[PDB]
Design a protein around this nucleic acid. Structure first.
Lengths: 62, 56
DNA sequence: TGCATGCA
DNA sequence: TGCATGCA
DNA sequence: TGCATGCA
DNA sequence: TGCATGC
């Protein structure tokens, strides 16, 4: 499994684990995003843009 | 682009920003994962499992 | 979005 | 079921 | 794995 | 030009 636990699976589009459970007869899910995903994704974006700016030239690179 | 910026794009399978650039003739790329992705994904996994046991 | 439902 | 999908 | 080709 | 895909 992706999780190694019954009912818990990684949703690739969402980048989150959903826990699927029965509520009486009704199948339901609860979403668990990696902690601080938004913060850390945004910080990764800034870091990537910063690097991109370093390499916005026509000379040979490091 | 998926970032706000030219040359930087989100790779979905990788769950990471890629910066595409030119080293003269060659096209290159550098990868940028969210800083503590592996650890925080694991924390989220353990929380999903905890919910599973509790809600069951 | 997070979620409930669809797919196989 | 694990996980992708449609929803406005 | 991270990277750079493939495709438009 | 962005970004999925194959190694």
């Amino acid at each position: 499994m992706s999780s190694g636990y019954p009912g818990v699976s990684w949703n690739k589009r969402m980048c989150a684990w959903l826990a699927f459970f029965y509520d009486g007869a009704s199948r339901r899910s609860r979403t668990f995003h990696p902690k601080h995903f938004n913060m850390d994704k945004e910080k990764a974006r800034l870091a990537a843009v910063e690097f991109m700016k370093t390499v916005e030239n026509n000379g040979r690179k490091k």
